[PDB]
Write a protein that binds this DNA or RNA. Sequence first.
DNA 1: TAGTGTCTGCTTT
DNA 2: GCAGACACTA
Lengths: 317, 99, 330, 341, 405, 325
Amino acid sequence: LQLPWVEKYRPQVLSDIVGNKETIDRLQQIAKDGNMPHMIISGMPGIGKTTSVHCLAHELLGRSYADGVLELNASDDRGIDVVRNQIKHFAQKKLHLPPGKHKIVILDEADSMTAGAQQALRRTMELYSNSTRFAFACNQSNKIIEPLQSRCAILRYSKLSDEDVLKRLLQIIKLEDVKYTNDGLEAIIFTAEGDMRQAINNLQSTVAGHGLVNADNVFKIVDSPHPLIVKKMLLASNLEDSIQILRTDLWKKGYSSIDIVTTSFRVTKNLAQVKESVRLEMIKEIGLTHMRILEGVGTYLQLASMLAKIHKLNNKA
Amino acid sequence: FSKIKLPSNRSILEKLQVFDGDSTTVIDGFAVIGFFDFTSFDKIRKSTKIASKVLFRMDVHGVLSVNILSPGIVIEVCMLEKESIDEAAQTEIELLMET
Amino acid sequence: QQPWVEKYRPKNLDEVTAQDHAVTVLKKTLKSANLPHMLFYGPPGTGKTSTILALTKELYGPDLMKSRILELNASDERGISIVREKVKNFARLTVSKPSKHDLENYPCPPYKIIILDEADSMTADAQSALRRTMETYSGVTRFCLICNYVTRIIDPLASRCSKFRFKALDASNAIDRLRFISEQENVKCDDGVLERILDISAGDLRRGITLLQSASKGAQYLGDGKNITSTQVEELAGVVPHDILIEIVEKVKSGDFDEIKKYVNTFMKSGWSAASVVNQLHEYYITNDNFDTNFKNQISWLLFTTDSRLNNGTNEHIQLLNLLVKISQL
Amino acid sequence: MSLWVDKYRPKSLNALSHNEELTNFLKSLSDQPRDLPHLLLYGPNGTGKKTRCMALLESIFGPGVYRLKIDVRQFVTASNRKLELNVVSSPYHLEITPSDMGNNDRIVIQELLKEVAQMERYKCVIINEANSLTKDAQAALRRTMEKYSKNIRLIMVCDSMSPIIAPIKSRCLLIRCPAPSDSEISTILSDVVTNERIQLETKDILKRIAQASNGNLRVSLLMLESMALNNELALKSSSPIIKPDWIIVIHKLTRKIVKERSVNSLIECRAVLYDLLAHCIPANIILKELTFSLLDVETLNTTNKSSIIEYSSVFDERLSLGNKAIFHLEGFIAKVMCCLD
Amino acid sequence: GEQWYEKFKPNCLEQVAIHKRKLKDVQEALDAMFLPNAKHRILLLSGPSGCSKSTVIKELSKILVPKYHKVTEFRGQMESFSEFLKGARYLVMSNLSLILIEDLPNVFHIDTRRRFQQLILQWLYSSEPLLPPLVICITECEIPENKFGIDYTFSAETIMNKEILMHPRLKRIKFNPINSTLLKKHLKFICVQNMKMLKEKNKWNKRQEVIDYIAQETGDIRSAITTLQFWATSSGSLPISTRESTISYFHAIGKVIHGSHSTNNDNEMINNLFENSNNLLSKEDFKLGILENYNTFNKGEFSISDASSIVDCLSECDNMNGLPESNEYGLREVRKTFRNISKQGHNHGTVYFPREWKVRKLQNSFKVQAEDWLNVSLYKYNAVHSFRNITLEFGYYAPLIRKCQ
Amino acid sequence: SKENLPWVEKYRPETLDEVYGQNEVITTVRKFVDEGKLPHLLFYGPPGTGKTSTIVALAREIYGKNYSNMVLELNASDDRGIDVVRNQIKDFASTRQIFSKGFKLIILDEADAMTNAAQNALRRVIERYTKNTRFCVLANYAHKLTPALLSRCTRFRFQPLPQEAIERRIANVLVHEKLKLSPNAEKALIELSNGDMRRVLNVLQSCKATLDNPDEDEISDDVIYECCGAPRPSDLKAVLKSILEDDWGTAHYTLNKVRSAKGLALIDLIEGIVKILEDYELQNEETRVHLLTKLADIEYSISKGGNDQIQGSAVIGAIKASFEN
DNA sequence: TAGTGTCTGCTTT
DNA sequence: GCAGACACTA
Ligand SMILES: Nc1ncnc2c1ncn2[C@@H]1O[C@H](COP(=O)(O)OP(=O)(O)OP(O)(O)=S)[C@@H](O)[C@H]1O
Ligand SMILES: Nc1ncnc2c1ncn2[C@@H]1O[C@H](COP(=O)(O)OP(=O)(O)OP(O)(O)=S)[C@@H](O)[C@H]1O
Ligand SMILES: Nc1ncnc2c1ncn2[C@@H]1O[C@H](COP(=O)(O)OP(=O)(O)OP(O)(O)=S)[C@@H](O)[C@H]1O
Ligand SMILES: Nc1ncnc2c1ncn2[C@@H]1O[C@H](COP(=O)(O)OP(=O)(O)OP(O)(O)=S)[C@@H](O)[C@H]1O
Ligand SMILES: Nc1ncnc2c1ncn2[C@@H]1O[C@H](COP(=O)(O)OP(=O)(O)O)[C@@H](O)[C@H]1O
Ligand SMILES: [Mg+2]
Ligand SMILES: [Mg+2]
Ligand SMILES: [Mg+2]
Ligand SMILES: [Mg+2]
C-alpha cells in the first residue's frame, strides 16, 4: 500500500514549502513570534495554500494541535446554524497555551460557503477575537464578503516559478532515487505550466509508465496544454496553416469543440498583442460559435468557418 | 464528551470475552477500540426497541455483526468501522476509561 | 368516421413503403433478439412513429403493451428528476412472464422497448441520464429515440443508438401508396394529380393524404361525377397561380419601388403565406435559362437568407418585401 | 349589443357575405363532420377566421354553439405559485387563449388538453393565436392530436404561418381566409348603415373607411361607430378619418425621425418607444408599422428606402431571435437616422 | 498579541474617523430622538464595510447617557429577536439605554426577512407612551456568486421593501468611506504611538510612501490598520495586499462609458472589471443601463453613427441569450467607441437608472384594466376577443364608444 | 444469456488486453496497478473511445470478486446533489475496507454534469480521504470541470482509435460472427468510423441484418452505403464536377437526380463535398473563407429547418460564387 | 483666491 | 469615470 507521490511527500514544515519566499518567511516569523492575525490566502489552486496553513498551525501549536484546531472544510455540514453553534462552542473553551499563542480555526474553501454563514462567522470573530483566530483558505478573495476581509490580513499567492518547482522536483527525485534528464524536467515544467501538483503527477506517470524521465516519454503520456495550442493557432498568419494546426492537434488528439471554443475565449480575453477592435470582433465571433455549438451544431465545419472569419477580419482583405 | 457505560453485572453483561485474533485464546488486559458512525447506531436503535438478547461480535477487520433475538425471529446486522481513529484519540479513550 | 391520416396508419411493417434498410433490419430482428437502440430521424411526416408502432405491434402483441411498453412524449411533464426516476424505474422493472397466447401467437423477445418520442425537446442532463441508463440497463431493456433534428441530440446518443435515416417520400416513393389509398377510398383523379400532390408536399405523405381527403370531400360535396384536377388541389394546398407569379416577376423586373410596395401590400391583403411564394419564385428563377450565372447565385443566396429569416418566426410582409426589393436591385 | 361586431355577427354559413369559395369549402367540410381533419386557419387579422370557425361549429353541432360559459381554474407551475387561465366553456365545443407566460404556457396546454381529451361525439377546441407559441406547447399539440385523434379536434387560427413549425402545418389542414376587397367591405358597410337608419350623404365615405382600415372588418366597424357617435348619427363627406392614437403616434414619430436626426431626437424616440411599450403593445407590430410609415415618405429616394427595409428585416430577425424588445427598435431607428443622411 | 484595531480603540469623540458634517448630523438626529417629542422613531445608517459606523453610536451613547451600560448589542433567531425587541420596548426609564441592531439577524430567507419587516412596521406604528431609542446599522456589500433583491446586492434597500425607508419617523444618513486625510492622520497617530517598535526596525525612513499608498488604496480604517500592523510586524521586502473593495452599479457604468484613469489600456481594465465584478456585469437590467446612459458622454453631442453602432452591437449581444461572451463584446465595443470619440469630450451629462420598473407597472395596470373590462363585458353579454386585438382595436375605440353612449 | 444483446454491449471489453488503440494508456495503467499505486486517474476523450469500459476492465483485473462491495459506481442516472454527494462519498471513503488489502476505487461516470459546490466537496474528499480510497473521473467535456479537480487528478487523454484498432476489432467481430467484408467495404467503414467503435458496431449489426443470409456471402461497400445511408464517394465526385462544370441547369438536375435516386440527405452530401474540397488547393486565401462561412450558415439553417431544394441550390450558388474569385 | 480634495448623486421593482 | 457645490488655508 504505497501512497501517491502527491500525498506521500506532503510538506510538514514551512521550510520544505517552496514558491513565495517572502510569504513563507513571513509565515515562519508569525509561527516563531506566535502573534497570529486573521488571514485570507487566495491564488491559483494547487500551489500550497492549505499545506502552508497546516504547516503554520503545526509550527505554532506543537502538542496543542489535538484540540486547538477546528478544520471545517467544504465537504461538511456547512450550514448556517450548526456551523455557528460549532464555532461558538469551539470559541467558548480555553486550553493551556502560552500567552503568545492563540487557537487557530481553518476554513478551507470558504468561497462556496453561504453568505448567512459568513455573517455568523463575522459575529463569532467579533465576539471571540481575544481567544481564537481564523485562517482562511480559498482560490479567490472575491467570493469572501467585504466586512470579513476587513477584519483580516490578505496575503495574495502568486504562481510558482520555474526555480521553486524545479528545486522541489530535484528533492523528490533525490528522495526516490530516480534517473532523470534535464530535457525531461524541462518538458515536465512546460506541461505543468506553473502547477506543482500537476508536475508531480506527470513525473509519477512518467516514472511509472516508462521509468527514465525523458521529454519524449512526457509528451507521449500527456499532451501539451490546450491554451498554448490555441494561442499558437490564433496568431497564425495564413488561414491554411491555422486550419491544419487546429485539425491535426485538436481533432486528432480528441478535443471537444465546446472546450476548444471556451479555451479560445479565455485566450482572446487574456491576449495582449492585439488591437481592441480585433479583440472584440473575435470575442463576438467566439460567442456566435459558442451559441451554435450549444444549440447542437458543433462540427469541424463551424470551427473552420470561425477561423476563416477571424483571419478575414485580421487581414481585412 | 458523552459516556454511557454498561456495567459488569450479568443481567445485561451475561457474557463478554476479549480474544487475541484466534477466537480460542481469551486474554485479559487488552483493549479493543471501535470507531463507528452515528448513522448506523441511529438505524439500529429502532431495531433494538423490542428484543430479548443482543449479541455483539466484531473481528480484527473492524466489521461488526449484531444479532437481535426476539419461537422468535433472528435479526443480524453487519456494520463497517471507520478507516482510522481521529489522530491518536484511542489513547485518551483508555486514559479516561480507567480515570 | 376517422381521418385518412389516422384511418390509414400502417399497423404492419409490410404496409410502409419507400423505406428499405430500416424495414429489412426490423423484419430480420423479428426472428431474433439482437435489437440495438434505434435513432429514428428524418423529415417530418415520414413514418418513424408508424414504423416503431408496427414493430412494437408485430413484436409482442396487444396484451403486452399494458405491462411491457411505456412511451415518453411532450404531453406530460419531463423534468430532470421525473425523467430520471421514471426511466430508471421502467428500465429496472422485470421482464413480464408472457402468457401462452402471446407465446404461440407472437414471437415475443426477452426484452422491452422504451419509446422516446420528440426527443429533440429534451435537456442535455436528461439526455445524459437517458444514455447512462440505457448503457447500464442494456440487458433486457431497449431504447428508441425519435427526433426530427439530429443536431439537437447530443453526440453520445447518436453514437450509442443505431442511426436509421428515414428518406423523404418523393413522388415516385409514395405514388403507389397514394394510388392504393385513392383506389380504396374510391377517389377519381386525372393523369398527374397524385404526382402534383406529392410534388407540393416534398417528403411529407401526411400533407398529401390531407390534401387528397380535402379534394375528395370537395368532389363529393360538388355532386357531379368529375375527376379532381391539379388546379383544385393546388388552390386547396395554397399554391400561388402562375399568372400572379408572372405578374410579380414583371413588377420586380420594372425598376419602380412604389409599384412593388403596393403590389406587396395587396398580396398581404390576399393573405397568402410567403414561404410558398418564395419556393415558387425560386423554382421559376432557377428553372429559367434567361439569366446568367452571377445573378442566379446572388438570387439563390438572397432566397436562402429570406427562408432562414422566415424560419425564425418573423413578419412575412417585411421579409417578402425585402427579398423582392433585393431581387429587383440585382 | 352596443357594438357592430357583436350585434351583427353572422351565425351561419349562409349569413356569410364575402369569400364565397371559403363558404363552399366550409360547407364541404361540414357535409361529413365525422371525417373532419385538424384545421389550421391563416390569413390577415380582422378577416373573420373566428367567425368561420363559429359558423362551422354551429353547422356541425347546431344550436347552443354560440352560448358561452365562464369557468376559472389554476395551474401550478413552481412550488406553491399558481397562474390562472380564464378559460371560456360552452356545450359541444371549447375555446382557450394563450394569455399565460411563454414558459408556463406549454405545461398549461399539456394539462388542459389532457383533461379535455379523456375518453369518449368528439369535442372541438379553437386555438387562438397559435402562432404565439415558444415551440414547446407545439410538441404537446403534435403528440396529442396524433395519439388522441378520436375525441378531440384542434382548430388553429393565426395571422402568420411562418412561426408555426412544419409538423404542425403537416398534421393540420391549411385553411385560407383572404381579406375582402373594397367592394365587399363597402357592401357590408352599406348594409349595416341601412339597418341602423343613419344618414349617408355619399357612398364615398364607406370606400374611404375601407381603404383606411386596409381590409379589416373590425377596424371598419369600429371606425363607423366612431364617426356615427361623434357626428350624432349623421355621416358627412367632410368628416375627418378617425384613426387610433397608436397609429397617430407612430406617424408622428416617423415625421420626427425624418425631420430631426440627432442624439436628443434619438433619446426622445426612445422615450416614445418606452411609453408605447408600456401599453402592452408587442414590439414586432410596432416595428412593422414604423417601417410602413417610413416607407411611404415621398422625400426619401430608392436607396434610402432599400436601406430602411433591409435594416427593418434584420432587426425583425433580431427581435424574433432576441429576448428584450427596446434594443432592436432602438437599433432600427438609429440605423434609419444613420442611413437617412 | 492583541490586534491593533482593538488595542487602539478610540476613547474620545475626536479620535473617531468621522467627518465633521456627518458627526454634526448624527448628533442632531440623536438629540432630536432623545427628546420626548420623537421626530424619528428609528435611525438607519447604511454605508460600506468598515467606515466607522458602530463606534460613532458607541461613544455618542457613552457621552450622552449620563446627561439625561452603553448599548445592548443583539447577538446573532426569530422568536429570540422578537423577545429581544419586546424587552427593548420595556427599557425607557432610569436606564435610557440605546438599542443597537448592529449585525442584524439572518435575512437571506424569505420568511425571516418578512417577519423582520412586519416587526419593524409594528414597532414603527406603535402608539405607546415614551420611546426607547433604536439605531439600525446596515453594511452595503453585494453577495458574490454562489435573486429579486437578496443574493445580488445586500444593502438597506434590499432588506427594506420601500416602506420603512419612506417613513416620516426615520432619518436615513448614508455613510461615506473614510477620508484619505483622516486615514493618514490616524496612521501617523499609530506610528507616533508605536515609535519604539518603529525605531526597532528600518521602517521609519520608508514610511511616507507606505502610508500614502495605504490611505489612497482603500477606504476602510480597520483594513488599513491591519495592513499597517502586518507591514510593521514583517521584517521587510514583503509586498502589501489590501482589502479589495467593490464597484457600485453606477460606478461600473461610469467606468465603462468614460474609462479608467489608473489603467489607460482598455483590455486590462475590462478584464479586471469582468473578473472582480462578474455578477454585476452578467446580471440583467445592466445592458439597459448602458443603453439609457450612453447618451450622456457629451450631453448628446456626438456622432449618430457611433450611437447606431452601439445599439446595433447591443442588439447582437442580446441575440446571444445573455452569454458572457456577448457581454464582453458589448462592453469592449462601447469602451472602444467612447475612447475613439473622447477626443472632444466636456461637460458630461448625469446618469440615471433605466425606466424599466415603471413600464412593468404600467403594463400590469393595463393588464388588470383589460381583465376588468373583459369581466364587465362578459357580465353584460357575450363578447370574447382574446387579448391581442384589445390593444390594437378595443383599447381606444371601446372607451370612447362607452363614453359617448 | 448472450447472443441477444446489441453489438455495442455484446462486445464490451472485460480485460485490459481487450482494449485496442490506446496502447500507451493501457501500459501505463498496468504499470500503475502492478506497483499497487493508483494516483487518482482522470480519463478524458471523445465518446466511444472506451473510458468506462477501460475502468471496468481495470477494476475486474485488480479486484476480481470484490467489485460487488468495494467499487462505488456513480453516474448521471443517480442523483448527485451537494448533500447527497457529500454524504454518500464521505460514508464510503471514511469506512475501512472489509478484508482486501488494496485501495478503494470510486468510479464517477459523466463527472462533467455536477454543480460547482459538489465538485468542490469531491475535490476536498479526494485530498482528505485518500489513505485507502481512490477516485476515478470520467467526462467528455473539460470546460464544465473545476480546474482544481484537473490538478489533483492525473489527466489521461483518449485519442480517437486509429485504423489498426478498428481493423483488429472488425476482424475479431468477423471471427465471432462468421462474417465477411470486402476490402473496399473495410475502407468505407474506416472512413465512416471517425474514430468511433459504437458506430462501427451498430452499422455492422445493421448491415448483417440487411443481408438475406448471414453466410455464403460477402459484404461490399454498396450494401454498407445503402444500410447506413451515407453517400457514395462517386456520387459526391459527380455532384462536385456538375457544380464546377454545369452552370446552373444541368448541375441542379444532376443534384436532384442524385438526391432522388437513393434518397441521400443534404447534411451528409455537404459534409462529403467539404471533405473533398479540403484536399483541393486554393491560392487566393479568400475563396476558402467564403466557402467555410456560407457552408456553416447552411448547416445552421438546416439544423433550424427549411427547404431542402432551396438549401441545395444555395450550396451550389455559394460554391460557384466562391470559386469565381 | 483657484486649486486640490471631497460629499452627493445616480434604484426602483 | 462624470458633474454640482462645499471645505479650508494657503
Ligand atoms: N511549495 C510547494 N512545495 C512542495 N510541494 C508543494 C508545494 N505546493 C504544493 N505542493 C504539493 O501539492 C499538494 C497540494 O497542495 P495544496 O495546499 O493542497 O494545494 P492548495 O494550494 O491548497 O490549492 P487547492 O487545494 O487546489 S484549493 C501538497 O500536498 C504538496 O504535495
Ligand atoms: N411508409 C409509409 N407508408 C404509408 N403511409 C405512411 C408511410 N409513412 C408515413 N405514412 C403516413 O403518414 C401519416 C403519419 O405518419 P407518422 O408516422 O406520424 O409520420 P412521422 O414520421 O411520425 O412524422 P413526425 O411524427 O411529425 S416526425 C399516416 O397517415 C401514415 O399512414
Ligand atoms: N480611529 C478610529 N476610528 C474608528 N474606528 C477605529 C479607530 N481605530 C480603530 N478603530 C476600529 O475600527 C472599527 C470600526 O468599527 P465600525 O466600522 O463602526 O464597525 P462596523 O460598522 O460593524 O464595521 P463592519 O462594516 O461590520 S466590517 C472598530 O473595530 C474600531 O475599534
Ligand atoms: N478500445 C476498444 N476496443 C474495442 N471496442 C471498444 C474499445 N473502446 C470502446 N469499445 C466499444 O465501445 C463500447 C462502448 O464504450 P464505452 O466505454 O462503454 O463508452 P465510452 O467509450 O466510455 O464513451 P462514453 O460516452 O464516455 S460512456 C464498448 O462496449 C465496446 O464494444
Ligand atoms: N362573411 C362575412 N360577412 C360579414 N361580416 C363578416 C364576415 N366575416 C367576418 N365578418 C366580420 O368580422 C368580424 C369578426 O372578425 P374576427 O373573427 O375577429 O377576425 P379574426 O378572426 O381575424 O380575428 C365580425 O364583426 C364580422 O362582422
Ligand atoms: Mg487546498
Ligand atoms: Mg410522431
Ligand atoms: Mg462595529
Ligand atoms: Mg463511459
